């Protein structure tokens, strides 16, 4: 679950057999093995330098994984093998739908492209980041499915709004105000506010919150000219000059967390490009 779309876990006992000729060439090139026989004996002896050479060999080599029920064109893909200590081939979770794979006993095959043209083809065409739409109707094939969907639904579900949150009518008679999303996330990490606890977040004149076409439930207009417009999910204070002074969104830490993580993913991608 901690692999990237381009990386896949590969066991070492398989990699040493697949890339055996490459590690033999490595042992011959460096001053570690005189001949092919001594290099093969050293590889059989499981010397520590052999694993280092194996890692250095496959840092830029693509691996072609495939499944027995290859119904669609996404049955065979390409990943970057990462050396692991085990006997089970690790796979990224988001890529399971494509292979119709479940970890209930399924097995997969591995293929190593020898020629340079085959390596270029595997690295450019057959990678996962280049195939995110099914060839049937052009719909996203890699999406959160079972547990990530549950987490996202818990994040964006909401809060008890009506009789569930209060026992008596508030007529006889939310509280936290955060200037930045970072402050609210830090307060949630410090257990100051719960996940579903309502709060107010100040926004810098964007009005990107999707909501119903509903008029303000109540509008407060003072003598000096500043009128407060209370909506269902946000408060928009303005002045006599028809100038939007302040905007406060009423939400929970989950929605702001999802928005911030998506925005920061985009911004980190843009920054890492440079």
């Amino acid at each position: 679950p901690s692999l990237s779309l381009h990386r896949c876990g590969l066991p070492r006992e398989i990699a040493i057999e697949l890339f055996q000729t490459f590690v033999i060439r490595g042992l011959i090139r460096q001053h570690l093995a005189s001949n092919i026989g001594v290099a093969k004996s050293k590889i059989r002896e499981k010397e520590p330098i052999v694993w280092e050479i194996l890692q250095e060999v496959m840092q830029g080599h693509p691996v072609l994984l495939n499944r027995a029920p290859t119904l669609h064109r996404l049955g065979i893909q390409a990943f970057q093998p990462v050396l692991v200590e085990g006997r089970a081939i690790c796979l990224h979770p988001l890529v399971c739908k494509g292979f119709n794979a479940d970890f209930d006993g399924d097995q997969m095959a591995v293929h190593v492209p020898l020629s340079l043209e085959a390596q270029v083809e595997a690295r450019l065409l057959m990678f996962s980041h280049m195939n995110l739409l099914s060839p049937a109707i052009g719909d996203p094939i890699s999406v959160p499915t079972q547990d990530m969907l549950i987490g996202l639904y818990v994040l964006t579900s909401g809060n008890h709004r009506g009789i569930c949150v209060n026992r008596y009518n508030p007529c006889n008679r939310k509280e936290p105000f955060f200037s930045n999303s970072y402050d609210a996330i830090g307060a949630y990490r410090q257990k100051r506010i719960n996940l579903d606890s309502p709060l107010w977040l100040r926004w810098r004149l964007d009005q990107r919150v999707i909501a119903s076409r509903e008029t303000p439930i109540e509008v407060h207009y003072e003598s000096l000219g500043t009128f407060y417009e209370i909506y269902g999910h946000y408060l928009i204070v303005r002045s006599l000059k028809k100038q939007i002074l302040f905007i406060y969104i009423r939400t929970t830490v989950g929605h702001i967390a999802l928005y911030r993580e998506i925005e920061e993913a985009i911004q980190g991608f843009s920054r890492a490009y440079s």
Partner: protein, 288 residues
């Protein structure tokens, strides 16, 4: 090798209110890196004390949210601006401050009068903007706590608006583990990333968190100077008067052991149980 060393691999100053530093701990056995990282994060986020404004006094403002003549912004706005001011101090207890800017000046900033102990970190912070000739006289109370967010001296007795104050100087902290293993031996490396608000450097925050954890884990080492067959023996077998027998039955006492556990005062408590009865049961028990 065999000696734990730390080194600051990265450090930068994005602004006067934001700092970043990354640290390392090369020699670590398996299982120690995660525990050390969690403890250091908890210490950085909860055990580091900060200095901030906890109170305000606005004699001119008669409301929590209102527009004064030349302030040009709401009192709530100036309070939210005041709560974002970072301060550096080593205060013990509470103190007082004051800002007495009296002019049509465009901006009110770094005009707060502070005792020597307290200091400001960023002067460019914007408190308010006076658009008309007016006397801005606000009183401020500053406190230092180990992340005690809730502190109210008088609970708004006088014309004082309590300000929500977070005493956490460290903005964010995170840890990662890199496991390098050669054959049988496996070594782990801990990477600590610290973001501070400018009151202290990430290295000083690391040192303070380490000392706080040590002080937390010391008191455990402190030392102070110095100057059954009764279950099977039910009360039914022992010959007892009917009244005390029924009383013991009602008091959920069925075996001798139970009676023995019960004390004389407790036995006396049972309804209808006379003091002489305590004698009778004691005598019958001593007979055995």
């Amino acid at each position: 090798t065999r000696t734990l060393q730390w080194k600051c691999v990265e450090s930068r100053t994005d602004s006067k209110r934001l700092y970043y530093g990354r640290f390392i701990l090369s020699p670590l056995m398996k299982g120690q890196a995660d525990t050390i990282g969690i403890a250091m994060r908890r210490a950085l986020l909860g055990e580091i004390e900060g200095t901030c404004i906890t109170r305000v006094k606005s004699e001119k403002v008669p409301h929590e949210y209102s527009t004064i003549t030349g302030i040009q912004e709401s009192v709530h706005e100036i309070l939210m601006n005041l709560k974002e001011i970072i301060l550096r101090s080593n205060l013990y207890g509470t103190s007082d401050a004051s800002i007495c800017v009296k002019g049509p000046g465009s901006v009110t900033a770094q005009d707060i009068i502070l005792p020597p102990y307290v200091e400001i970190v960023d002067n460019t912070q914007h408190i308010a903007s006076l658009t008309e000739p007016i006397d801005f006289c606000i009183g401020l109370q500053i406190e230092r706590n180990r992340g005690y967010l809730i502190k109210t001296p008088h609970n708004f007795q006088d014309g004082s608006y309590p300000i929500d104050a977070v005493f956490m100087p460290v903005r964010n902290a995170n840890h990662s583990i890199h496991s390098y293993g050669n054959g049988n031996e496996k070594q782990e490396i801990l990477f600590l990333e610290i973001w501070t608000n400018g009151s202290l450097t990430p290295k000083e925050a690391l040192h303070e968190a380490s000392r706080n954890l040590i002080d937390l884990f010391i008191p455990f080492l402190h030392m102070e100077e110095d100057n059954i067959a009764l279950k099977s023996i039910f009360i039914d077998q022992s010959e007892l008067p009917s009244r005390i027998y029924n009383c013991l039955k009602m008091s959920n006492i069925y075996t001798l052991l139970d009676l023995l556990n019960n004390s004389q005062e407790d036995l006396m408590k049972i309804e209808h149980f006379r003091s002489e009865d305590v004698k009778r049961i004691l005598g019958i028990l001593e007979k055995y």
